[PDB]
Structure formats: C-alpha cells, structure tokens
Write a protein that binds this ligand. Structure first.
Ligand SMILES: CC(C)(COP(=O)(O)OP(=O)(O)OC[C@H]1O[C@@H](n2cnc3c(N)ncnc32)[C@H](O)[C@@H]1OP(=O)(O)O)[C@@H](O)C(=O)NCCC(=O)NCCS
Ligand SMILES: CC(C)(COP(=O)(O)OP(=O)(O)OC[C@H]1O[C@@H](n2cnc3c(N)ncnc32)[C@H](O)[C@@H]1OP(=O)(O)O)[C@@H](O)C(=O)NCCC(=O)NCCS
Ligand SMILES: CC(C)(COP(=O)(O)OP(=O)(O)OC[C@H]1O[C@@H](n2cnc3c(N)ncnc32)[C@H](O)[C@@H]1OP(=O)(O)O)[C@@H](O)C(=O)NCCC(=O)NCCS
Ligand SMILES: Nc1ncnc2c1ncn2[C@@H]1O[C@H](COP(=O)(O)OP(=O)(O)O)[C@@H](O)[C@H]1O
Lengths: 729, 400, 402
C-alpha cells in the first residue's frame, strides 16, 4: 500500500516540484547522477515522495504535468540492477515493480488531469510513466523515439505497459503493434497508433501546451477530468475481452501464430507478454497489473533475460562507444567511395554507402554488368517508394549518387575502396593493381573477402598500411554487421577510418585479427558442417531444418548451405588440408566434407547452379530434394531433436572460444554481437560466448553445465565437441 | 465387477443439419424429453422411481445446454425427483462415456437402473461456445502444443499415406451404407421422429445424408484448412521429420455438424426383470486410453486394444466394428492398425453421412450396433471414438 | 468386486469473493497445483497406471470450459492415456466425481483414478453457464423454478428455526473451523497456492471470520429479499406450499455458505493398484447413494440419500462416528440434524462452508478429504458425507478408516 521501497529505519532526489498559481504541479524528472532518467532506486524514492505530496496537497492541486529536464524524457528500467536478479530475488523484483505501479496508479486516479510533456525519447519505463498520464504531448524533434522495447532485452513492460496498452488498444493490437516486437516509433508514428495524443514543433511549447490542455479539460469535461477510459462505468475493451465471442473465435490461434513466428525457439518473453496481455484482460485493472508483475519477475530471474541484457544492452553499448576502435586516432571524412564488383555484395555495398549520403563509383568489367548492379538499388528504391518509406526526390538523389562504370580511370578522386570480386587471391591482386595508382594516395584499400587472409591480399598493393578487410554479409541492405579485419601490416589509423565508416552507414563493427576464416566464416562453418554431418549420419533432412529453426537461427542449415556455395565449402576444406599436409601433418577431415563432395559429384552444388539440398525453380526455392533420402539413407539415424539443436549451437560456441584463445577476437562483446549480427546466432543465447557462461540445460546452468553437456555430446558424436582447456579447472 | 449391466432400450432422434436444419427451432432439452416420452410410450408401466440416475454427454454445456441439462430433462419430463441427472463432458466420446459410466454404476452395485445418452444442438450451441481452459490461456496453449483435430486428421493422412482419393472413397462408402441402412428399414425402430408441442412432424430422417454422392462430386470439394492460424507449423514442430502436411479433408469426408440426442436404458438383470424389460445386449467391457495430443485423433487404437485385452478377446472375435467417422483418415488408420475387415466396419454408414452431434454420437453409434447385432443375428460389437487432446474410449457389447 | 480405497485427499485453501487472493489464479492452475503436490508426495508413482481424472465443475464455461479435467491432464504433463472428464451434478459435483471414481474402480475396468472438483466462483460466477430451468420460460414455469436460498428460508419457516437458531449454528461453524485450523487439523491437507515464481498467493481459508459474535450475526440483513419480492419467487414457493402463510427470511451472508474459489483432488484405487505403487490406503469407500425430494424446497435432498446409503451399507445413525453435510444454509443443516437425530458433537465437527466457503464443484471432494483426516485424527471408524443439490437432488457416501 506504501509508495516506498522501505517502511523501517538515503538516495538522491530526482524530481523537481513546482506548483503554479492555478494549482498546477509540474514534476520535472532530473536525475543528478546521469544524462538520462532511469527507473532506479533514486527515481522510485523520488516519485514516492512526489506522489505522497500530490495526495497531501490535493485540496490545492488542480492538475499535474510530468516533464523532463534532460535531452530525453525517460529512458527505462535500471538494467545494471535487473541483470543481477537471482531466482531467490523473485519476491524483491515483484515488490519493486508493484511499488513502481502503485505510484503510477495513484497518479492516474488522482481525480485531476495529468499530462506527460515528452521532450525526447520515452522508452520502456519511460513510456510507462507517460501511459499512466491522461494525455500525452510529444515534441516532434530530431532523434526522438517512443516505445516499449523491453522484449528486446527478454523482459516485458512490467511497469504497467502491458496492462495499459491492452486497456488502450485491445489484446491483438497492443501485442502486434507495440508489445511483441518492442518497436521504437518516431513521434509522428506514435501519434498515429495512439501512443501519443498531440504534437508540438519545439520542446519549449510542451509545458505551456500541457497547462493549456489541463485548463480546457477542466472547463469542458469536469466530470471525466483525470479519468482514464478504462476507469469509466461503460468501458469497452477494443476488440472485446476474451469472453466476447468475436475475440474468443480467434484467440486460440494467437499462441500458435506466435510459435509460428518464433519457429519454436526458446524465447520466453513474447510468450509471457501474450499470457500477461490475455490474463490481464480477463480481470479488473489492479488484478491485471499484479499478474503483469508476476510474469515480469519470471523473465527477470530467468537466464534468457540475462543473456539478452548482456548482449543487447551491455555488449552493444560497449561496441557503440568505440571499445574495439584504437584510442589515439581522429577522424578522416570520406569524399568518394569506389566499389569493385557489381554482384549481390558489391551492389549491396554500393546501396548502403549511397543511402548514407556518399558518392559511389561502382566498377565492374563491363558497363552492362555495373548497370545491373545499380539496378539492385533501383529495385530496393521501387519497394521503398511503394511502401511509402521515402520520397521520390530523396530516392532520385540516392540513386544519382551511384555512377556505374567499366573504366578504371573513373576511380579518380576515390578515397575509400571496397573490393567485392570473386574469392580468388591472384584476381584480387590484379583488381587492386589496376586501381591503386588511380585512387587518392591516402585511400583505404578494403577487401570484402570471406576466407582469404588479409595479410596475403595486402602484398598485391604498394601501400599495405591502408589495406584492410571490410567484410559485409548477404544481403547487405539488411545485415547489420561489418567484420573489420586487421592484416599484419594494417595500421591503427586505417582501423579507425573503417570503424567510423561502419557507424556512418548505420552498421555495427567488430574488429578482428587476421587469420584464415576470420571469426564469422570459421564459426558459421562449424554450424553448417554439423548439419551436413547429420545428413551423412542418416538424419531426416526435414528434422535437420527443424532443429536449425527451433534452435533460433534465422535460416535452417541446409537452406543456408545452398547460399554459401558448396564449391566454396570445398575449396575452404582443400585449403585447410593443404596447410596441414605441407607442414608435414596428417589432416583429420570433418565428416561433412564427404557429404559436400558427394553433392558436387551429383551436380547439386548449391543455389547458384540451380540445385542443392533444395530444388530451385524459376528463381524460387521449391522443396527439399526428394532424392536426398535415398542418397543418405535418411531415417536410419533418429537422434533426439535436442541433440541436433545442441550439436549446432555447441559447435559454434566451442569454435568461438577457440577464436578468443587464439586472439582472433579481442572481446566477448565482439564475439556475441558478431555472432548475432554476422552469422545469425540465436538472439536468446546472447551470443556465442554468452552461450557458454549462460548455458541452461536439463542438468544445470553456467560454464560448468556447458562443459558437462559438451562432454556428453563428445561421447555420443565425436571428439570435436570436447571443450578447450580455457573452459576447464 | 459384481452385477452384469444390460442394455434394454437404445433410441435416438434423427440428426438435423447445420444450415436451414429442421431441428434448429428445437431446444436441446426438448430433444431429450422427446426421447424420454418414447421410452414412456414403449413401457407405460415401468416404475420410474426405480430409475436412479440420468447421465448425459454434452460437449458445450452452455446457454440452452447449461445448468445440468440431464436434471432439466428429469424435471421437465416429470420424472421422479429422485432420478438424479448429471451432465458430463469427455469431448467426442461423451455419449459413450455416459453409457460406460451408467454400466459401471450398475456393476458397482449401488445403482440399479440408469438412463444414459447425450445431446448436442450444434446449430444452436456451436462447438467452442463453452470457451475452454486451454484457449483462454496462452501460457498453457503455448506449452501444450494445441492444434485443431482437422489438422491431426490431415497429418494422419500424410504419415500413413492416404491420398485425397483414398479418403473420398471412404466418404462415398459411408454415404452408400447409410442410404442402404435407411432404405433397408434398419433404422425404423430406433430413429424416433421429432414432433412439436402439437404432434406435428418436425423431422423423421437424417437430413445431412447426401445419398447421391459421387467420386467426381467429392473430388470437386475444397480442403477445410488449406483454420487460418499457424497450426500446421506447430504440428510440424512436434513431428519434425515430416516436411509438409497434405490437406485432404473436406466437408465431404469429415463428420457433419448436426443436431441430435440419444438415450440408452441400462440396468442389472434384476432391475430389468422386475420391471418386465427384455435385455437386448450386455456390456462386456469398457476402456479409456489415448495417444499423442497433436495427432489428437489416434486414441481409438490403444483404447480398442485395451478393451479387447480386458474381455479376453481378439479382433477375430468381433463381428462388427463401429468407429465414429470424425474424419476419413482416422477410420482408415484404425482399419490399417488393426487389420479390420472392410465388411465389418461402420456397416450402416457413419457421421460423414449422418452427422456427428458431439455429446450424443457415442450413444447413437452404440444403439446402431445393438440393432445391427440383433438384425444380423450376430454376437459381438466393439464401439469406439477418438477424442480431443488425444483420448479414446471403447466398449464391447454382446447380444443376449 | 474390487473395493475402492482413498489413497490421497488434498485441497487448496479457499479464496474469498471480494478482493480474494485466488481471483488472479486460473481454475486450471488450481488443479495443476494439486497434481504437483501429489507428485511431490509420491515421486515414483507410475502415472501410466492412472486411467482417468474426473472433475466436478458446476459452471463449466470460459476458464472452466473445454473439459477442464482433460486440460489438467495435459497442462500438468500427465500421460495422454490418463483421460479427463468434467461432470456437473450441481453442489454435489465434487463428491459425485469421487463416487463415480469409486464405482469405476469397483467395476474392474479402471485401476487408479484422480477425482475431485474445481470452482473459481470469483472468475466464473454461479449461473454463468445459462440453462433451461432458469432461462427458458416454458420449462421454468413447468419446474416451478425457485432459487435455493428461498427454499432454505422456507425450510426454516416450516420447521420453526428462528433467525437466532440459524445464527447460532453459524457461530458454531466459525468456532469449529477456527479450532480445526489452530489445532493443525488442516496442516497436511490444505496445500498453499503459489505463483509461477514460487511466491505465496494464499495459505488459509480467507473467508473465515473467527471473531464472529452472536451480536454481529444479529445485525446482518436478510440476503434473499432482493430475489424474493422483486422476483416473485416467494409467491411461486407458496403456491406449492399453500398452507404456509408467509416465508420467514432468516438467511444472511453470515449464515449461508460463502462464495469462494478453490479445488480438491482425491486419489482412488483398488488394493492391488495401491500395492503396486507402494501407497498406503487411508479409507475404504463403503457405499454411495443418489436420491432426492421436492425441487421447489430444493434442499431437502440430503435426508433420503443418507437413508439409502445407510440402508445399502446395512448401518444406522448409531454406526456412524462423524456426519459431514455441506453448510449451504444453516436451516438445511438443522433440518437434516433434526430429521435423523444426529448428535451435535458428531456433526460438521471441523467447521463448514459458512466459515470456509462453498466452491461449488470442489466442495464435495473437500469435505470428503476433511472426513478422511478427521477419522484418522480421532482414530474413529466411519464417516457419512452428504450434500444438497439444485432441483431437489442428494448424494451420500460412507467411508471407513483403514
Ligand atoms: C535513451 C537513449 C536512446 C539515448 O542514449 P544517449 O544519451 O545517446 O547515450 P547513452 O544511452 O549511453 O546514455 C548515457 C548513460 O545512460 C545510461 N542508460 C540509458 N538507458 C538506460 C537504462 N534503461 N538503464 C540503465 N542505464 C541506462 C547508459 O548506460 C549510460 O550510462 P553511462 O553514462 O554511465 O555510461 C539510450 O540511452 C537508449 O537507447 N536507452 C535504452 C532504452 C531501451 O533500450 N529501453 C529498454 C530498457 S528497459
Ligand atoms: C463439417 C466441417 C468440415 C465444416 O464444413 P462445412 O463447409 O460447414 O460443411 P458443408 O456441408 O457446408 O460443406 C461445404 C461444401 O461442401 C459440399 N459438400 C459436402 N458434402 C458433399 C458431397 N457428398 N457431395 C457434394 N458436395 C458436398 C457442400 O454442398 C458445401 O457446398 P457449398 O460450399 O457450395 O455450399 C467441419 O467444421 C467439421 O466437420 N468439423 C468436425 C467436427 C468435430 O469433429 N468436432 C470435434 C469435437 S471436440
Ligand atoms: C453468501 C451470499 C448471501 C452472498 O452474500 P454477500 O453479502 O455477497 O457476502 P458478505 O459476506 O459480504 O455479506 C455479509 C455482510 O455482512 C458482513 N458479514 C458477513 N459475515 C459476517 C459475520 N459472520 N459476522 C459479521 N459480519 C458479517 C459482510 O461484511 C457483509 O457486510 P458489508 O455489506 O458491510 O460488507 C449468497 O450469495 C450465498 O450465500 N450464496 C451461496 C450459493 C449457494 O448456496 N450454493 C449454490 C449451489 S447451486
Ligand atoms: N523421431 C523420429 N524421427 C524420424 N522418424 C520418425 C520419428 N518418430 C517416428 N518416425 C517415423 O514413424 C515410424 C515409426 O514410429 P511411429 O510408429 O510413427 O511412432 P509413434 O508411436 O510416435 O506414432 C518410422 O517408420 C519413422 O519413419
């Protein structure tokens, strides 16, 4: 019943109190311990005092304005605290979140209007404070975002967000539009979907507009002033409650549709949100609110929220703040980008560089080729215009930034080279040779290569200081990682320049040391290699694909195997074998290699040649190749599905730890985000390094549990699953 | 296990169709009361005080079917106030479960004479009307991999390799045998025409029947599913080795949505003799079992095995097999699993032809078998139905 | 042939109707909760040997729709062969569930059966399911429909039970439930309800008012004059009971059963079935009976059902150590006691639904379990359990301690 965290025998104050001559109270949130307001212990004690005071001085208060003194409005829950909650802390987490909501409930049932003056970003806990107000005005300023993204951290909006948006929009709309994906909206979108009521052009207009609104509301609607729609006698939930026939008809389909979207992946958060949403709608507001707390406490004290908070809060933050960017180096703005190659990659790289505002020369071996490469951007722009995400004027300027050419001389004035030609060393030497003297003397010489060591590519140029790996992922317009690779002679300055370029194009960088297969290619290799081995062992291809999807991968492994060329997989294996055999050693082939070779011999080497594990008809993937079953005696091996899932995940986790040991990666932050953004390692794991420390299985949690399971898989499937020394006592 | 349980009467209404059906205007309670008054007419001197319970299957016990419809029937028909009345729901099997429970009550020795049966006015109280602890609860709907039964039927067809033509051939055969049974006069005694408050005829025949069904006609029909949710994907998440569900079930090879009711009088030998009743069959054994909850219509196979084992009998010992025609593939799979001779199976047609009024079907197909054993002068019938969630119920009856 | 034995009998605490602890809890979770307690007590039980789960539920709609028993089997991950049937015999549902389980076990065709009930009255109010007797005019007229509360007042009027008489019974129920709780009688059988995080939701019978006084009971307003005068049900009752001039409305919120949420589970089987699973029998089901009396008075059904069950077992009132009759209304208990001449000290000895509440479909199984425990505690031999029902039905069961 108390607004406070304690009721027996000192935190900082974060709320400035001001009462007008009219009786309007402005509460200005201004945490003195940081640049943003977070739902921390100081906030909680501060709002408890303020809310107590609103009650105490109710005879002299006509209205309330909730505002912020920061660049942003309010930035959400305290992650630093939430990440530490053990199962035995469920009671405290539940109590904390009930206290937060008690305060907001008092705010909302005060008998007077409360208006949120949203100067900037209102996210998670931030928007929840706003939803507890009766009216929301937002400043339509640059960079301002509104939304409830706690699902992206494996949490839910536990400060009333679920209950209120369901009360506002009904179950289906609140879930699909706001809650399930936790999307961040611009102030204009926020207004359209109803998260916000009004917009003003500037921040200074907010408080006055809010006070004006309170004044008019008291005059025009005295009976209903400060009463949320759900608190009125005749309230009707949009879309109905679960007991209403219309909704009842579709409701059983909601969990199945969700399981369809998630493909059976073990991500507890969307499920918990849906249960909270529905259960809440069955009962009065306060009961609905309390159910919400229980589901919140459940996610928080669980492992996935821990994994996801670590990756999508802590690791991302560290990366975005230049954790892998060398210290001393300043900026070098980019004037003209040159792209070599007009296939998917080069065309893609040209698009993202152009979209970011850069002039691009797109060079291929013929003008026809280079033109069709620019056509890739034209296709994307056509879709972007149809979906209404850009203007004709803006699009035309984007496309006009790309000049397709066949002529090497057109790389004059180019200060950033990104090469994306065929995976061949001598070719890349030739292609860079044709260009190194034409470009600016200080130009970056970047290579998009998936396996060939950068040190070996650099020798084909004169200025090896400026030669670097700039590794993108297909399709480039969608994939958010750039893997930056430092060759032996690559300078620190060259690193920063490419680092800065990545941020400039709206992508996330990892910095990796030169080594064959780098980080991304080597690790993804282990994943698909496990799948092909299962196919060779006699496992149903359908099961293999199900295991990939239910593991949480964005694409099943055999499907993916088709996109990576099987001939490319072959020459990777040939290269590894050569290095060992030349150094007087004996090569131990992965069991997958025989399956790769089998498919080559069958003339089914992947999508690029029209046939792989799948059948391809008229640019479309049809179904699995029915001849697969006879070829590999499918069905003769039927291991538990969880063994298949684990084989894939564990192969990658183990290989990630090797990369860390060998110094290929220099931080677990890079390992995690790199695995997630580069090679589609499942978001629920928090990444391929987090997977180790955060492992949870039938027989325990943590590094010790991971080690046990890995030994379990080793005994069953082969020594490749034995953990590296670095993981053991 | 003391007192033997006997079937003395087994009657039913005709089944009215879902769209513009003759029974739509008739309250489910009236359907039951009509059957009570037929039994009254058939045995005008029965001492009704000797009836200790009325047990009815009802799958959507809500609205017109709420408030314990069995007790409503007892009171509305003016039966003695001591005659009980209990509603039960074991989904599709409800009707037979009521008979089984009635028989078990007699065997225990603590009841003497019981009315069992069921009622479903699907045109007035649609399937799903009662809500559902599962669906109203995403948390357990999510955990328990709920898929509607139609999807399971399609999945059975996919796994066992029953084609669209295979399932439609079964449908055509159901219609043919229902028609033959009707023309043959097989049902004249057991289908009790429904009449209004004035004695005027409302319905005297199973109006869902389409006796002129053809192979060609059935092939023209569209598949029922492809519900518009994500249930296929869910099904395949459990059955990871299956690539694609083949959707072969249509309105032509699935059971009809219909209105209907059934009553069965069950009693000990003494109970029947004392009231001058002639026993028609004996309940040999009953069983409740089940199988996988996603392929949910595969529970009749272990339930049959369990009732056979329990009565010391084998498939060879059974003259007539009666399995509810919820979906063509369920029947074909049951026939395949147990090597059931075609000419022993659903010999008078089934629910594809005549409809499947959920809570009543069990009792209807039981009565159908009582009559057929008598007519063929045969000895043993096994009656079975699949159930939602993956349950199965089964009963052996022997003609006396 | 086979005897039916009770191996376990457990229940949830009963959550109250207004601002109740269990309002936030789905009735399905109430059952799953109790299933998990049974697993905890016998972790090595072979669940494949459980052939059915039979649950009484009077309002089987919404959260309680769709065969809640089957839902419990699946939700708790019990074997898919383990059945699940919902039944509804109004107030007697819970005991009817048990009796049916016993009859199934006796018949030989079931080995081991979970029986019980669940009613979440705060989420699924009584009457939520509709029904012809109330909602179809032709048959409402035909059955002379009258709310049971009016029958209770009419019983009081005919028997000469005064308002003080019914309140005095109410006080005793309160005193006896408080003594049972304080005495630890309910420690093993009432299973606290917890959330998904293991946090406590409820561990006692919230509806109880152990500080009830006769003064406070006297202050209460008759509850059923809102249905009586503004529904015409008084006049309907008196058209049948034509010699009665005026119904004395003596029942209030303080001497009628409480509207509550709760669930109960009972494990029933044959000697062989228990032996196989290392279970110790606690009581034997001696006999069951269903019967009835007039549907307008509605709540005199317990008497002929009790007589029939005593006769079936070849016993008399004298042979029975404890009598447990559901406290739907005080007058119904007082009528029963007077009719059969039940000694006071043998009747509802641990308190009843006036104090603890009457969660419709579960009550029968709760008060059964209560007797299993009280017999074991006192080291007594036999209890007879009975409940009144809607439309004039009655069910009775005699259990014998093993
Ligand atoms: C609001 C935002 C867009 C603006 O960020 P910014 O001001 O450009 O820079 P930062 O985000 O680094 O903010 C600076 C500080 O605020 C902190 N901060 C921001 N949101 C926080 C949260 N939800 N919990 C804890 N700390 C937070 C950062 O950790 C950082 O701490 P530091 O200065 O001690 O290193 C950004 O802080 C953000 O995206 N916040 C997260 C909101 C979110 O994801 N919602 C879900 C959380 S429940
Ligand atoms: C019956 C069910 C398929 C719904 O189908 P439906 O389309 O409503 O049924 P209809 O009779 O309208 O069939 C659709 C079409 O097929 C046609 N059709 C059906 N049988 C036919 C036959 N033998 N020959 C030719 N046409 C036929 C109908 O004429 C109709 O044609 P139209 O679309 O031109 O009007 C489905 O709801 C069902 O049966 N579910 C099973 C219920 C169950 O098992 N319950 C589980 C208990 S828990
Ligand atoms: C119980 C019933 C009378 C509802 O009563 P209610 O008024 O909702 O419940 P309450 O306990 O609030 O009513 C008693 C009033 O006196 C008070 N009161 C109740 N018991 C009391 C006691 N022992 N001592 C002192 N005061 C008491 C309550 O606080 C309430 O007062 P308030 O108005 O100041 O809050 C009625 O709905 C009922 O008993 N139904 C039972 C259903 C049944 O018999 N079975 C159906 C099977 S078909
Ligand atoms: N886990 C599995 N992986 C691959 N195939 C399976 C699996 N389970 C069953 N099957 C298929 O089903 C057949 C045998 O199992 P089945 O009888 O279907 O088991 P169930 O009792 O689950 O129905 C095999 O021929 C096989 O093709």
């Amino acid at each position: 019943s108390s607004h406070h965290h304690h009721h027996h025998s000192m935190p900082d104050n974060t709320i400035q109190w001001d009462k007008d001559a009219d009786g309007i109270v402005t509460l200005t949130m201004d945490d003195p311990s940081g640049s943003t307001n977070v739902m921390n212990e100081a906030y909680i004690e501060s709002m408890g005092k303020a809310v107590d005071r609103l009650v105490a001085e109710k005879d002299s208060i006509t209205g309330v304005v909730v505002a912020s003194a920061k660049k942003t409005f309010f930035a959400g829950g305290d992650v630093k605290t939430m990440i530490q909650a053990r199962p035995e802390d469920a009671g405290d987490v539940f109590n904390t979140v009930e206290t937060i909501k008690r305060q907001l409930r008092t705010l909302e049932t005060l008998g007077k209007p409360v208006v949120a003056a949203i100067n900037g970003a209102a996210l998670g806990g931030g928007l929840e404070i706003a939803l507890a107000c009766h009216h929301r005005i937002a400043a339509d300023v640059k960079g301002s975002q509104l939304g409830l993204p706690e699902v992206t951290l494996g949490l839910l909006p536990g400060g009333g967000g679920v209950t209120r948006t369901v009360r506002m929009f009904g179950i289906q709309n609140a879930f699909v539009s706001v809650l399930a994906q936790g999307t961040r909206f611009k102030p204009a979108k926020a207004k359209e979907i109803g998260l916000v009521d009004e917009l003003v052009a500037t921040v200074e207009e907010l408080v006055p507009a809010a006070k004006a609104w309170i004044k008019e509301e008291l005059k025009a609607n005295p009976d209903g002033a400060g009463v949320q729609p759900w608190d009125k006698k005749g309230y009707k939930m949009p879309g109905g409650t679960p007991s209403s026939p219309g909704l009842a008809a579709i409701l059983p389909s909601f969990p199945s549709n969700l399981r369809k979207q998630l493909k059976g992946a073990p991500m507890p958060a969307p499920r918990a949100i849906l249960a909270a949403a529905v259960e809440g709608a069955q009962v009065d507001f306060d009961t609905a609110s309390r159910i919400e707390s229980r589901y919140f406490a459940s996610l928080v004290t669980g492992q996935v929220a821990k994994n996801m908070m670590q990756a999508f809060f802590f690791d991302l933050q560290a990366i975005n703040a230049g954790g892998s960017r060398p210290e001393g180096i300043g900026k070098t703005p980019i004037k003209r980008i040159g792209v070599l190659g007009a296939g998917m990659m080069g065309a893609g790289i040209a698009y993202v560089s152009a979209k970011a505002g850069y002039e691009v020369v797109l060079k291929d071996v013929s003008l026809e080729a280079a033109a069709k490469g620019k056509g890739y951007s034209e296709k994307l722009e056509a879709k972007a215009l149809e979906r209404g995400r850009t203007t004709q004027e803006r699009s035309d300027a984007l496309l006009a930034r790309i000049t397709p050419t066949a002529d090497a001389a057109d790389f004059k004035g180019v200060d950033f080279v990104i090469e994306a030609v065929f995976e061949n060393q001598e070719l890349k030497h030739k292609v860079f040779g044709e260009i190194e003297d034409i470009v600016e003397p200080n130009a970056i010489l970047g290579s998009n290569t998936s396996t060939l060591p950068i040190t070996g590519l650099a020798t084909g140029v004169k200025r090896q200081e400026d030669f670097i790996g700039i590794h993108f992922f297909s399709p480039v317009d969608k994939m958010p990682l750039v893997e930056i690779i430092k060759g032996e002679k690559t300078s620190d300055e060259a690193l920063a320049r490419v680092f800065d370029y990545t941020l400039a194009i709206g992508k996330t960088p990892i910095v990796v040391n030169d080594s064959r297969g780098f980080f991304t290619s080597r690790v993804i290799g282990t994943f698909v290699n496990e799948a092909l081995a299962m196919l060779g062992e006699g496992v149903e291809p359908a099961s293999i694909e199900q295991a990939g999807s239910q593991a949480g991968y964005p694409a099943p492994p055999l499907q993916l195997s088709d996109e990576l060329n099987l001939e490319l997989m072959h020459k990777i294996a040939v290269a590894t074998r050569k290095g060992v055999e030349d150094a007087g050693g004996t090569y131990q082939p992965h069991p997958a290699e025989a399956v790769v070779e089998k498919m080559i011999e069958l003339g089914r080497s992947g999508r690029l040649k029209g046939a792989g594990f799948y059948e391809y008809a008229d640019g479309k993937r049809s179904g699995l190749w029915p001849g697969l079953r006879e070829t590999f005696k499918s069905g003769s091996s039927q291991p538990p599905l969880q063994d298949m899932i684990d084989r894939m995940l564990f192969a990658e986790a183990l290989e990630t730890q090797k990369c860390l040991d060998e110094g290929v990666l220099t931080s677990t932050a890079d390992a995690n985000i790199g695995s997630i953004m580069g090679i589609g390692f499942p978001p629920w794991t928090g990444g391929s390094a987090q997977f180790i420390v955060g492992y949870s299985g039938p027989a325990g949690t943590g590094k010790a549990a991971f080690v046990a399971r890995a030994r379990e898989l080793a005994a069953a499937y082969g020594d490749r699953f034995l953990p590296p020394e670095s993981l053991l006592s | 296990m003391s007192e033997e349980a006997f079937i003395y009467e087994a009657i039913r209404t005709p089944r009215g169709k879902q769209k513009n059906g003759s029974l739509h205007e008739v309250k489910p309670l009236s359907l039951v009361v009509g059957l009570i008054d037929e039994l009254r007419k058939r045995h005008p001197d029965l001492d009704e005080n000797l009836i200790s319970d009325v047990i009815l299957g009802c799958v959507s016990p809500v609205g017109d079917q709420g408030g314990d419809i069995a007790r409503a029937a007892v009171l509305a028909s003016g039966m003695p106030v001591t005659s009980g009345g209990v509603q039960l729901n074991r989904f599709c099997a409800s009707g037979l479960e009521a008979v089984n429970t009635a028989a078990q009550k007699v065997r225990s020795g603590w009841d003497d004479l019981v009315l069992a049966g069921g009622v479903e006015s699907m045109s007035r109280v649609p399937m799903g009307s009662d809500g559902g602890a599962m669906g109203l609860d995403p948390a357990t709907n999510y955990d328990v991999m709920f898929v509607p039964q139609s999807i399971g039927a399609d999945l059975i067809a996919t796994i066992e390799g029953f084609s669209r033509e295979d399932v439609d051939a079964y449908a055509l055969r159901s219609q043919q045998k229902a028609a033959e049974a009707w023309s043959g006069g097989y049902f004249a005694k057991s289908v009790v025409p429904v009449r209004d408050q004035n004695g005027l005829l409302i319905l005297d025949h199973d109006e869902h029947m389409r006796p002129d069904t053809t192979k060609e006609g059935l092939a023209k029909l569209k598949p029922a599913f492809e519900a518009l949710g994500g249930f296929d994907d869910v099904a395949l998440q459990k059955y990871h080795w299956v690539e694609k569900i083949n959707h072969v079930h249509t309105g032509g090879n699935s059971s009809g949505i219909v209105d209907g009711a059934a009553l069965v009088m069950i009693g000990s030998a003494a109970a029947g003799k004392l009231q001058g009743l002639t026993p028609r069959a004996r309940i040999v054994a009953t069983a409740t079992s089940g199988a996988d909850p996603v392929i949910m219509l595969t529970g009749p196979t272990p339930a049959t095995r369990k009732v056979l084992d329990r009565a010391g009998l084998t498939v060879d010992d059974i003259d007539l097999f009666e399995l509810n025609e919820a979906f063509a593939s369920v029947v074909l799979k049951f026939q395949k699993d147990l090597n059931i001779p075609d000419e022993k199976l659903n010999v008078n047609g089934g629910a594809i032809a005549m409809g499947h009024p959920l809570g009543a079907t069990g009792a209807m197909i039981l009565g159908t078998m009582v009559d057929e054993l008598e007519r063929r002068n045969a000895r043993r019938a096994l009656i079975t139905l699949c159930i939602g969630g993956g349950m199965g119920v089964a009963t052996i009856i022997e003609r006396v």
